[PDB]
Amino acid sequence: PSSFLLVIPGLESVHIWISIPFCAMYLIALLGNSTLLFVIKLHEPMYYFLAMLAATDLVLSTSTIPKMLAIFWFNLKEISFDACLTQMFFIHSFTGMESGVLLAMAFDRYVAICYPLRYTTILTNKVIGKIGMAVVLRAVLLVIPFPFLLKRLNIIPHTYCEHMGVAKLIKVNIIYGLFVALLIVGLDVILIALSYVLILRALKALSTCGSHICVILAFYTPAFFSFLTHRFGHHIPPYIHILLANLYLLVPPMLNPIIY
């Protein structure tokens, strides 16, 4: 096909009033990430990982809001196929990178707490760069097959091209979609838990790790809520499902810069 006609389907009567929270959240996220990157322009590995997280988060947020805002305001609901594939790949790759960055931050905190005297000699600008490149390469490689698999095979009740939503237009893609979740997100939980049990097994030094727990709580718990509502949420009408997905995707960009 040439174009896709995107469509909150239940609340089709009033649409201007719904766009105010999304516009405000996008502006807040953009301003916070811009300030966080500007302040660095503090040369410590943890701050490097924080900067990478902020940059990836900002680029992810800027790739979904404008289409939704345009649909809400200008009622221009046509998206080219190439744009849909690009948006899908960008969204999924940036979610994977964000998870990888969180894992790297946890590792840095562990190596700081358990080895306070060998913290600099172990983490070297070269090794940190290699770790970051490895995380980016893993995310890109694991996100690269999705557009190809979809292109191997016209109304979307959503606001952006989601792979699960687009795939409804079956029994094979879901296996890989579940495998990738338990490789870049499922393994992050295990490694973070193992890096926290080891730290606690080892007071002021334990309070520096407090801010990093809030980010995990604000980024993982919405994911668990979305997973539960995407597997047992049948009685709820679809517009609630759309609002919940948008909120779960958008509020971590709002919360992250305000915490750090």
Side-chain angles (χ1 to χ4, degrees), residues 1-2 4-7 9-10 16 18 21-22 24 26-27 29 32-33 37 39-40 45 47 49 51 53-57 60 65-67 70 72 81-85 89 91-92 94 96 99-104 106-107 110-112 114-116 119 127 129 132 134 136 139-140 145-150 156-161 163 165 167 177-178 181-182 186 192-193 196-198 200 202 205-206 209-210 212 215-216 218-220 222-223 233 237-238 241-242 245-246 249 252-253 256-257 259-260:
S2 64
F4 274 173
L5 297 173
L6 295 174
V7 152
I16 300 291
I18 310 181
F22 288 161
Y26 173 65
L27 286 178
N33 278 295
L37 267 283
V39 77
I40 293 172
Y47 273 62
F49 307 129
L53 160 73
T56 289
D57 158 81
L60 171 57
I65 298 300
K67 193 45 171 209
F72 283 168
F81 181 90
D82 300 0
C84 184
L85 283 208
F89 176 75
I91 283 181
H92 289 297
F94 288 153
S99 193
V101 175
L102 289 188
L103 169 36
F107 175 70
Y110 153 63
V111 85
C114 282
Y115 297 100
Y119 170 81
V127 179
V136 166
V140 164
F146 278 110
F148 165 85
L149 171 138
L150 183 95
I156 310 181
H158 213 330
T159 41
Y160 66 87
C161 278
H163 171 280
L178 191 78
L182 265 75
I192 288 166
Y196 267 79
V197 152
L198 275 183
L200 206 150
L206 272 293
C209 188
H212 179 274
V215 162
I216 287 174
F219 180 89
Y220 280 44
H241 297 165
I242 305 304
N246 265 290
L249 181 63
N256 289 358
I259 296 189
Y260 273 108

Short mmCIF file of all heavy atoms in Angstrom, two decimals, residues 75-130, unseen atoms left out:
data_model
loop_
_atom_site.label_atom_id
_atom_site.label_comp_id
_atom_site.label_asym_id
_atom_site.label_seq_id
_atom_site.Cartn_x
_atom_site.Cartn_y
_atom_site.Cartn_z
N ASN A 75 -5.87 17.04 12.15
CA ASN A 75 -6.69 15.97 11.58
C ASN A 75 -6.09 15.42 10.29
O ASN A 75 -6.81 14.93 9.42
CB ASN A 75 -8.13 16.44 11.34
N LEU A 76 -4.77 15.49 10.15
CA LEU A 76 -4.06 14.90 9.02
C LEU A 76 -3.60 13.51 9.44
O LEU A 76 -2.57 13.36 10.10
CB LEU A 76 -2.90 15.77 8.58
N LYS A 77 -4.36 12.49 9.06
CA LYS A 77 -4.18 11.13 9.57
C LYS A 77 -3.61 10.19 8.52
O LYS A 77 -3.97 9.01 8.47
CB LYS A 77 -5.50 10.59 10.10
N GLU A 78 -2.71 10.68 7.68
CA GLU A 78 -2.08 9.86 6.64
C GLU A 78 -0.59 9.74 6.94
O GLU A 78 0.08 10.74 7.17
CB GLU A 78 -2.30 10.47 5.26
N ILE A 79 -0.09 8.50 6.94
CA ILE A 79 1.32 8.23 7.19
C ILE A 79 1.85 7.33 6.08
O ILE A 79 1.22 6.32 5.75
CB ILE A 79 1.54 7.58 8.57
N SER A 80 2.99 7.70 5.50
CA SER A 80 3.60 6.87 4.48
C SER A 80 4.13 5.57 5.09
O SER A 80 4.48 5.52 6.28
CB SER A 80 4.73 7.62 3.78
N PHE A 81 4.18 4.52 4.28
CA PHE A 81 4.62 3.22 4.75
C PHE A 81 6.06 3.26 5.25
O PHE A 81 6.39 2.65 6.27
CB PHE A 81 4.49 2.17 3.64
CG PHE A 81 4.91 0.79 4.05
CD1 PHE A 81 4.00 -0.09 4.60
CD2 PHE A 81 6.23 0.38 3.89
CE1 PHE A 81 4.39 -1.37 4.98
CE2 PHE A 81 6.62 -0.89 4.27
CZ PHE A 81 5.70 -1.76 4.81
N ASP A 82 6.91 3.99 4.54
CA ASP A 82 8.31 4.11 4.93
C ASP A 82 8.39 4.77 6.31
O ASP A 82 9.18 4.36 7.15
CB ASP A 82 9.09 4.93 3.91
CG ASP A 82 9.06 4.31 2.52
OD1 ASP A 82 8.43 3.24 2.36
OD2 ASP A 82 9.66 4.89 1.60
N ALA A 83 7.57 5.79 6.52
CA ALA A 83 7.54 6.47 7.82
C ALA A 83 7.11 5.52 8.92
O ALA A 83 7.66 5.55 10.03
CB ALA A 83 6.60 7.67 7.76
N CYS A 84 6.13 4.65 8.65
CA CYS A 84 5.69 3.70 9.66
C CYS A 84 6.80 2.73 10.03
O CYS A 84 7.04 2.47 11.22
CB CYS A 84 4.46 2.93 9.15
SG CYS A 84 3.74 1.79 10.34
N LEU A 85 7.51 2.20 9.02
CA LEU A 85 8.61 1.29 9.31
C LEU A 85 9.71 1.98 10.10
O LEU A 85 10.24 1.42 11.07
CB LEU A 85 9.17 0.72 8.01
CG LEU A 85 8.36 -0.39 7.34
CD1 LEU A 85 9.26 -1.30 6.53
CD2 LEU A 85 7.58 -1.18 8.37
N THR A 86 10.05 3.21 9.71
CA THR A 86 11.08 3.97 10.41
C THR A 86 10.69 4.22 11.86
O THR A 86 11.51 4.05 12.77
CB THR A 86 11.33 5.28 9.68
N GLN A 87 9.44 4.62 12.09
CA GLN A 87 8.99 4.90 13.45
C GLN A 87 9.02 3.65 14.31
O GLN A 87 9.46 3.69 15.47
CB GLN A 87 7.58 5.50 13.41
N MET A 88 8.57 2.52 13.76
CA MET A 88 8.63 1.26 14.49
C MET A 88 10.06 0.93 14.91
O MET A 88 10.34 0.66 16.09
CB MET A 88 8.07 0.13 13.62
N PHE A 89 10.98 0.95 13.94
CA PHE A 89 12.37 0.59 14.24
C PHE A 89 12.97 1.53 15.27
O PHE A 89 13.62 1.08 16.23
CB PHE A 89 13.20 0.60 12.96
CG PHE A 89 14.66 0.33 13.20
CD1 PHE A 89 15.11 -0.95 13.48
CD2 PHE A 89 15.59 1.36 13.14
CE1 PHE A 89 16.45 -1.20 13.70
CE2 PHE A 89 16.93 1.12 13.35
CZ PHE A 89 17.36 -0.16 13.63
N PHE A 90 12.75 2.84 15.11
CA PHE A 90 13.32 3.80 16.04
C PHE A 90 12.78 3.59 17.46
O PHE A 90 13.57 3.56 18.41
CB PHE A 90 13.02 5.22 15.57
N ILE A 91 11.47 3.42 17.60
CA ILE A 91 10.88 3.26 18.93
C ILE A 91 11.46 2.03 19.62
O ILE A 91 11.93 2.10 20.77
CB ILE A 91 9.35 3.18 18.83
CG1 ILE A 91 8.75 4.57 18.62
CG2 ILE A 91 8.77 2.53 20.08
CD1 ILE A 91 7.24 4.56 18.54
N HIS A 92 11.46 0.89 18.93
CA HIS A 92 11.90 -0.34 19.59
C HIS A 92 13.39 -0.29 19.90
O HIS A 92 13.82 -0.69 21.00
CB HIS A 92 11.54 -1.55 18.74
CG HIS A 92 10.07 -1.83 18.71
ND1 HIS A 92 9.35 -2.16 19.83
CD2 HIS A 92 9.18 -1.81 17.69
CE1 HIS A 92 8.08 -2.34 19.51
NE2 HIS A 92 7.95 -2.14 18.21
N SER A 93 14.20 0.21 18.97
CA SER A 93 15.64 0.29 19.21
C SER A 93 15.95 1.20 20.38
O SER A 93 16.84 0.89 21.19
CB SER A 93 16.35 0.77 17.95
N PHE A 94 15.23 2.32 20.51
CA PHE A 94 15.53 3.23 21.61
C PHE A 94 15.07 2.68 22.95
O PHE A 94 15.72 2.92 23.97
CB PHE A 94 14.93 4.60 21.33
CG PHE A 94 15.63 5.34 20.24
CD1 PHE A 94 14.98 6.28 19.48
CD2 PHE A 94 16.97 5.08 19.98
CE1 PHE A 94 15.63 6.95 18.48
CE2 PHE A 94 17.63 5.75 18.98
CZ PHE A 94 16.97 6.69 18.23
N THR A 95 13.96 1.93 22.98
CA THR A 95 13.59 1.26 24.22
C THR A 95 14.68 0.27 24.65
O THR A 95 15.08 0.23 25.82
CB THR A 95 12.25 0.55 24.06
N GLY A 96 15.19 -0.52 23.70
CA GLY A 96 16.27 -1.43 24.02
C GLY A 96 17.51 -0.71 24.52
O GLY A 96 18.15 -1.15 25.49
N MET A 97 17.87 0.39 23.90
CA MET A 97 19.04 1.09 24.37
C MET A 97 18.81 1.62 25.77
O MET A 97 19.67 1.50 26.63
CB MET A 97 19.46 2.19 23.41
N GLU A 98 17.65 2.18 26.04
CA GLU A 98 17.39 2.68 27.38
C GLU A 98 17.57 1.58 28.42
O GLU A 98 18.19 1.80 29.48
CB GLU A 98 15.98 3.26 27.45
N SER A 99 17.06 0.38 28.14
CA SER A 99 17.24 -0.73 29.07
C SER A 99 18.72 -1.06 29.25
O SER A 99 19.19 -1.27 30.38
CB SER A 99 16.47 -1.95 28.60
OG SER A 99 16.39 -2.93 29.62
N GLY A 100 19.47 -1.10 28.15
CA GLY A 100 20.90 -1.37 28.25
C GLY A 100 21.64 -0.32 29.07
O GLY A 100 22.54 -0.65 29.85
N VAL A 101 21.26 0.95 28.89
CA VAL A 101 21.91 2.01 29.65
C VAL A 101 21.63 1.86 31.14
O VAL A 101 22.51 2.07 31.98
CB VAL A 101 21.46 3.39 29.12
CG1 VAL A 101 22.03 4.49 29.98
CG2 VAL A 101 21.89 3.56 27.68
N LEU A 102 20.39 1.49 31.49
CA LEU A 102 20.09 1.26 32.90
C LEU A 102 20.94 0.13 33.47
O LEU A 102 21.46 0.23 34.59
CB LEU A 102 18.60 0.94 33.08
CG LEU A 102 17.64 2.11 32.86
CD1 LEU A 102 16.23 1.72 33.25
CD2 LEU A 102 18.10 3.33 33.64
N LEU A 103 21.11 -0.95 32.70
CA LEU A 103 21.96 -2.05 33.16
C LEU A 103 23.40 -1.58 33.38
O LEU A 103 24.03 -1.92 34.39
CB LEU A 103 21.91 -3.19 32.15
CG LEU A 103 22.87 -4.39 32.20
CD1 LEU A 103 23.21 -4.83 33.62
CD2 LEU A 103 22.29 -5.55 31.41
N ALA A 104 23.92 -0.78 32.45
CA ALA A 104 25.29 -0.28 32.59
C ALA A 104 25.43 0.61 33.82
O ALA A 104 26.44 0.55 34.52
CB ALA A 104 25.70 0.49 31.33
N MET A 105 24.41 1.43 34.10
CA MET A 105 24.44 2.27 35.29
C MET A 105 24.48 1.41 36.55
O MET A 105 25.22 1.72 37.50
CB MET A 105 23.23 3.19 35.32
N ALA A 106 23.69 0.34 36.58
CA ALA A 106 23.72 -0.56 37.74
C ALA A 106 25.10 -1.18 37.93
O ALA A 106 25.60 -1.27 39.06
CB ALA A 106 22.66 -1.65 37.59
N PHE A 107 25.73 -1.61 36.83
CA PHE A 107 27.07 -2.18 36.93
C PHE A 107 28.07 -1.15 37.46
O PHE A 107 28.94 -1.48 38.27
CB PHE A 107 27.53 -2.71 35.58
CG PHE A 107 28.95 -3.20 35.57
CD1 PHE A 107 29.30 -4.36 36.24
CD2 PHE A 107 29.94 -2.49 34.91
CE1 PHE A 107 30.61 -4.81 36.24
CE2 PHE A 107 31.25 -2.94 34.90
CZ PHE A 107 31.59 -4.10 35.57
N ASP A 108 27.97 0.09 36.99
CA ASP A 108 28.87 1.14 37.47
C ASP A 108 28.69 1.36 38.97
O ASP A 108 29.68 1.49 39.71
CB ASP A 108 28.63 2.44 36.71
N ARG A 109 27.44 1.39 39.44
CA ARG A 109 27.20 1.57 40.87
C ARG A 109 27.78 0.42 41.67
O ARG A 109 28.37 0.64 42.74
CB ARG A 109 25.70 1.71 41.13
N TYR A 110 27.63 -0.81 41.18
CA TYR A 110 28.20 -1.96 41.90
C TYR A 110 29.71 -1.86 41.98
O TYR A 110 30.30 -2.06 43.05
CB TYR A 110 27.80 -3.26 41.22
CG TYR A 110 28.79 -4.38 41.43
CD1 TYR A 110 29.05 -4.87 42.71
CD2 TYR A 110 29.47 -4.94 40.37
CE1 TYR A 110 29.95 -5.89 42.91
CE2 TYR A 110 30.38 -5.96 40.56
CZ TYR A 110 30.62 -6.43 41.83
OH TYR A 110 31.52 -7.45 42.04
N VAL A 111 30.38 -1.56 40.86
CA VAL A 111 31.84 -1.50 40.87
C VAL A 111 32.32 -0.33 41.72
O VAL A 111 33.44 -0.35 42.24
CB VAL A 111 32.39 -1.44 39.44
CG1 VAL A 111 32.43 -0.01 38.93
CG2 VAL A 111 33.78 -2.05 39.39
N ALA A 112 31.49 0.70 41.87
CA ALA A 112 31.85 1.80 42.75
C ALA A 112 31.76 1.38 44.21
O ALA A 112 32.65 1.69 45.02
CB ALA A 112 30.96 3.01 42.48
N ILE A 113 30.69 0.68 44.58
CA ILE A 113 30.45 0.40 45.99
C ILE A 113 31.36 -0.71 46.50
O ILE A 113 31.96 -0.60 47.57
CB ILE A 113 28.97 0.07 46.23
N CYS A 114 31.49 -1.80 45.73
CA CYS A 114 32.25 -2.95 46.23
C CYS A 114 33.76 -2.73 46.13
O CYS A 114 34.53 -3.30 46.91
CB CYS A 114 31.84 -4.22 45.50
SG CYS A 114 30.28 -4.91 46.09
N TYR A 115 34.21 -1.92 45.18
CA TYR A 115 35.63 -1.62 45.00
C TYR A 115 35.82 -0.11 44.93
O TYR A 115 35.91 0.46 43.84
CB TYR A 115 36.20 -2.29 43.75
CG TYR A 115 36.17 -3.80 43.76
CD1 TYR A 115 35.18 -4.50 43.10
CD2 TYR A 115 37.15 -4.52 44.42
CE1 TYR A 115 35.15 -5.88 43.11
CE2 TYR A 115 37.14 -5.90 44.44
CZ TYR A 115 36.14 -6.57 43.78
OH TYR A 115 36.12 -7.95 43.79
N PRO A 116 35.88 0.56 46.08
CA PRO A 116 36.05 2.02 46.06
C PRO A 116 37.44 2.48 45.64
O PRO A 116 37.57 3.60 45.15
CB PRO A 116 35.76 2.42 47.51
CG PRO A 116 36.15 1.23 48.30
CD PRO A 116 35.82 0.03 47.45
N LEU A 117 38.47 1.65 45.83
CA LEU A 117 39.83 2.07 45.51
C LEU A 117 40.25 1.75 44.08
O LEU A 117 41.16 2.39 43.56
CB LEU A 117 40.83 1.41 46.48
N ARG A 118 39.60 0.78 43.44
CA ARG A 118 39.91 0.38 42.07
C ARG A 118 38.81 0.80 41.11
O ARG A 118 38.60 0.18 40.06
CB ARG A 118 40.15 -1.12 41.99
N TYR A 119 38.08 1.86 41.45
CA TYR A 119 36.96 2.30 40.62
C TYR A 119 37.42 2.96 39.33
O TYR A 119 36.84 2.71 38.27
CB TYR A 119 36.08 3.27 41.41
CG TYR A 119 35.03 3.98 40.60
CD1 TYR A 119 33.84 3.36 40.27
CD2 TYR A 119 35.22 5.29 40.18
CE1 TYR A 119 32.88 4.01 39.53
CE2 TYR A 119 34.26 5.95 39.45
CZ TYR A 119 33.09 5.30 39.12
OH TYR A 119 32.12 5.95 38.39
N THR A 120 38.45 3.80 39.39
CA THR A 120 38.99 4.46 38.21
C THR A 120 39.83 3.53 37.34
O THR A 120 39.71 3.59 36.11
CB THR A 120 39.83 5.68 38.63
N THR A 121 40.64 2.66 37.94
CA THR A 121 41.55 1.81 37.19
C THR A 121 40.84 0.72 36.40
O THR A 121 41.42 0.17 35.47
CB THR A 121 42.56 1.17 38.16
N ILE A 122 39.62 0.36 36.84
CA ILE A 122 38.80 -0.65 36.18
C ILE A 122 37.94 -0.07 35.06
O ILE A 122 37.79 -0.67 34.00
CB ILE A 122 37.89 -1.38 37.19
N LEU A 123 37.38 1.11 35.31
CA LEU A 123 36.55 1.81 34.36
C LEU A 123 37.48 2.82 33.70
O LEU A 123 37.98 3.73 34.36
CB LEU A 123 35.40 2.52 35.06
N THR A 124 37.71 2.64 32.41
CA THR A 124 38.59 3.52 31.64
C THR A 124 37.79 4.02 30.46
O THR A 124 36.96 3.30 29.92
CB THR A 124 39.83 2.77 31.14
N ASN A 125 38.08 5.22 29.99
CA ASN A 125 37.27 5.79 28.93
C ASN A 125 37.12 4.82 27.77
O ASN A 125 36.07 4.79 27.12
CB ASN A 125 37.88 7.11 28.43
N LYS A 126 38.14 4.03 27.52
CA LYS A 126 38.08 3.06 26.43
C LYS A 126 37.10 1.94 26.75
O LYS A 126 36.30 1.55 25.89
CB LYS A 126 39.48 2.50 26.16
N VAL A 127 37.15 1.41 27.97
CA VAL A 127 36.28 0.30 28.33
C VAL A 127 34.82 0.76 28.40
O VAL A 127 33.90 0.04 28.00
CB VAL A 127 36.73 -0.33 29.66
CG1 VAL A 127 35.81 -1.47 30.06
CG2 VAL A 127 38.17 -0.81 29.55
N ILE A 128 34.59 1.98 28.90
CA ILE A 128 33.24 2.52 28.95
C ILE A 128 32.69 2.69 27.54
O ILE A 128 31.53 2.36 27.26
CB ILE A 128 33.22 3.84 29.73
N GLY A 129 33.52 3.21 26.64
CA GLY A 129 33.09 3.35 25.25
C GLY A 129 32.80 2.01 24.60
O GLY A 129 31.84 1.87 23.85
N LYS A 130 33.64 1.00 24.89
CA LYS A 130 33.39 -0.33 24.35
C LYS A 130 32.08 -0.90 24.87
O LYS A 130 31.32 -1.51 24.11
CB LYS A 130 34.55 -1.26 24.70
#
